[PDB]
Amino acid sequence: PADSYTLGFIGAGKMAESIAKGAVRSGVLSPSRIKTAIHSNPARRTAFESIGITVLSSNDDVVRDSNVVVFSVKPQLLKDVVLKLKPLLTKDKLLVSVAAGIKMKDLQEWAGHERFIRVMPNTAATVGEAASVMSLGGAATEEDANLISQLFGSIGKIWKADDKYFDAITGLSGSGPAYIYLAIEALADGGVAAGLPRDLALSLASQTVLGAASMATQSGKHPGQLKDDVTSPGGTTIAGVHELEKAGFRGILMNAVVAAAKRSQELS
Amino acid sequence: IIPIPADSYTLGFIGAGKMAESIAKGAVRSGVLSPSRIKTAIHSNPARRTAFESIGITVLSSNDDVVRDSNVVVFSVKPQLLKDVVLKLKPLLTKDKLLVSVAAGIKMKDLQEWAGHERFIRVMPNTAATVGEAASVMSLGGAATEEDANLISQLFGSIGKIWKADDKYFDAITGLSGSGPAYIYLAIEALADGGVAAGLPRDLALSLASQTVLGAASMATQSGKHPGQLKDDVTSPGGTTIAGVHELEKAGFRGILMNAVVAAAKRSQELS
Amino acid sequence: IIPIPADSYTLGFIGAGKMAESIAKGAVRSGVLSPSRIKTAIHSNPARRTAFESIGITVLSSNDDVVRDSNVVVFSVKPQLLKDVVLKLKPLLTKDKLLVSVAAGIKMKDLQEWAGHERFIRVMPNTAATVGEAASVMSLGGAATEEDANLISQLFGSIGKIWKADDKYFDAITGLSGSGPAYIYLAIEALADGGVAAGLPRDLALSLASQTVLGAASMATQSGKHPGQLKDDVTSPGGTTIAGVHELEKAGFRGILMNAVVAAAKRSQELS
Amino acid sequence: IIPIPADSYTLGFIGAGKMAESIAKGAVRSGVLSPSRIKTAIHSNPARRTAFESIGITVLSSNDDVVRDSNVVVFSVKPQLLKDVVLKLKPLLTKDKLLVSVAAGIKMKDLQEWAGHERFIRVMPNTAATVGEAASVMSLGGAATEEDANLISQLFGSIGKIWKADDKYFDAITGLSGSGPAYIYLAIEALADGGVAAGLPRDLALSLASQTVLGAASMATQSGKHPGQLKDDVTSPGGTTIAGVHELEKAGFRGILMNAVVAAAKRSQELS
Ligand SMILES: [Cl-]
Ligand SMILES: [Cl-]
Ligand SMILES: [Cl-]
Ligand SMILES: [Cl-]
């Protein structure tokens, strides 16, 4: 039903909006094939209506009218929401959760069936550059997985992974953007420290990060090869790299991923 | 100094390396100009010849002929070779031709002395020109006009973003946008290593690392927000992200990156 | 639970220490209360008696009489003494009287158990109550009404700013706003020492340090800007400010402050 | 050198930037000056024009006319531009006019040489002038009178606190009160980040951070106590505050701040 399927969003937050916008913009879905439900927030109703999507008055009606249901409510609220909708969550409907930290075992127990996909996107869904990972429930089919890959492909990239990896993933793709935000600010501060105007420094920092990551994503090269490509003999770049290595830069980043992943596990 | 005709100028590349090829490809692909308006010269490199010919560009046998036939000349030879190349061409570098250098570390004062005139623009692109995401900066010689600058904006816009700055900033720029990609390549590797340390398969860890960095930078470039606001947006109370961020801070992560920029900039100054 | 009369309620302080004095002075100075509407009890301390009497407040001879005559009772005895004080008063702590605790580290669950009812508000002020610049947070007991909260907001608004938070945040609040002033006192002394190290006279260095900190915090409070944006506003290219900031970052200054808040919060939990 | 009429002097701003605006607003708001006694000149810049006009101040078309019409002339152009601005105005800078520079890093010796006379006061305000909480210091040229100084005390008192110091201290003052606000902006962000690390919501953490810093500085400015005494006042035995302080001390927090001031001061001297 991939071509004509109806998608329903339970939870009308930013992630749902990003998905909806991405799918419409990429032609995966038309707005008439999407529904959401909102209560008592005007800004959010307007967000969906302004892209041509119908906002219904209840979660129940969104589920009834949807082949695929995406849950994006706050993780702490999800169990009760799925609970309440359970009679309507028939096995013919593919359920998807984007809730951070909620395992597949639990999603399946709450819904009462295993036709469930978990996707963990990250913050960059907003600009269509999410790093997402999906895990499949016990009854999710290969076709269900392709549908979801096509849907989340509209907001970034998507990879498959076993549910047991999702803590670590959270420490890397989930939390990693913050590490890069710090890097970007620090690079701009560095520019300014070196005598650059602040606006130029920040512009350059952000676009430098973007370009390097683009090289990494497109080049097919190991990052060490990419580093080798730009480190001319005795040049400026190696001088900067050397400072990084003196400080144990790589290990600091390893430490951040490990700590975030451990925190993820502790938070359950 | 006659204005360069914006819609019909011809472009000549002296130096037929990867940056030239990126600029030429980009400019043709983006419709800035058609291959028939572009010339390069290549001496006994049939591989580089094929690269230019295969996008519809005429390869001439001499630098001299490229310059004669061109309103705008882009010099992308290795920096160490640029002086002699400009001195040899000098009689042909008349003031009606806009000259551009992409050579790293060569200051405008020198370009102008070598050429004998001031109708010269300097651009410093970076390695991401290969994927059309360069961070470039341009500085204007004493006779380069606003219209010259715009012509160059539109040309280097094809390989990434381009900003203007005074030539005196170019050492610091070199340390930030020129060198910065290597800092990010390290960061990507380290993030991947970290993923693996936390139990992730390597291919997934590397895929996620690169795309996480790409996404965050895309947020920074598009959101209109300060990076501190972006960080605040993703750091939930007592959550995983703030745990990771705290580790960064404990270690002085920001100051490490500042140190790298400052060092690279200082090296740039040293190298002249 | 009868509403407390917003314009005419009487306020009683059990515990006549500095915080009580600051609240009383603040409320009188701001016109929230007149001194005739405030009572306290002081057993053998003519110094504290003088402090209250000198601002027009009646000092009674027993806690019991303060409670009987008061609609709102503020407990500000030392935290280790509070349980026994509340237990002794319990027969008088009828549900028509709003109880307030400013005791550090005593949770709402305990306050309510001791008093035998839930018409209780907990506040954690900080030391700057003495100059009307407290950072205070309040948490509501299970029977405290919105009107009770507003009454307390107004009262603690007389000595600084007051925010509302769930009692589960109070360890962390204790580590930040409760303990934070000491971190800033260190910072002020260190800034002054740094001024002197740079050649300034001591009185000027200390004056400048305090006022620099005051001014910056005032900018932070009033500007509506993120602190990163504020920092960007003052860091001129290659200038003195960024030189100083770079030193902070090399040393992991930010992480150190994060560590102090975390440690203090952890200690608060430990002492629970 | 005729005395500047204390109650009726006219004030002229050469440079219409943010600092000039803060001074003008402050002096008007505080009743030191009426807007009709203030002039500025804005050339080719309407946003600045609106800022001054919207507080009742006449914007003239030339620096020359501002100088002619003013008893006191405040120079607040970018430091790099000040020399040429003063040289151009020099014929109009008669010894009956009190000259004032707020330019960072420009020494009195230079101001006096450029103007050709010594009836000059230098002030170094800081960024908190925007909120009336500048830390400012003044130094007197060789012909500035005590009455000139008092006039400038009153004028800069309207945007914060103002002290007097010998010109030789100004590099250190620049590293402390000029640059210091950035150190505190970092501190505020870090304290907020720490609160989030400890489980606080971001908005509360930032609000608490800022107000904690404000309060502590207010305690320092008003209490008449040494910062060490203030620290002792809030460090209860084995309590949360001393646990946080201990973490700061383990990390050498005070030394880090000293380093920042020293580095900023050294940079100031370096920049001349
Ligand atoms: Cl290099
Ligand atoms: Cl998080
Ligand atoms: Cl500065
Ligand atoms: Cl304490």
Residue numbers in the entry:
A (entry chain G): 7 to 274
B (entry chain H), C (entry chain I), D (entry chain J): 3 to 274
What did the original publication write about this model?
The pathway preference appears to depend on nitrogen availability, being the ornithine route preferred under nitrogen-rich conditions.
In apo structures (unliganded and complexed with L-proline) loop L3 occupies a part of the coenzyme-binding site. Moreover, in these two complexes the imidazole ring of His45 lies in a structural position similar to that of adenine from NAD(P)+. The presence of chlorides was verified with the use of anomalous difference electron density map, resulting from diffraction data collected at 1.7196 Å wavelength. Therefore, as inferred from the crystal structures, chloride ions should be rather inhibitory as they compete for the same site with the carboxylic group of L-proline and, most probably, P5C.
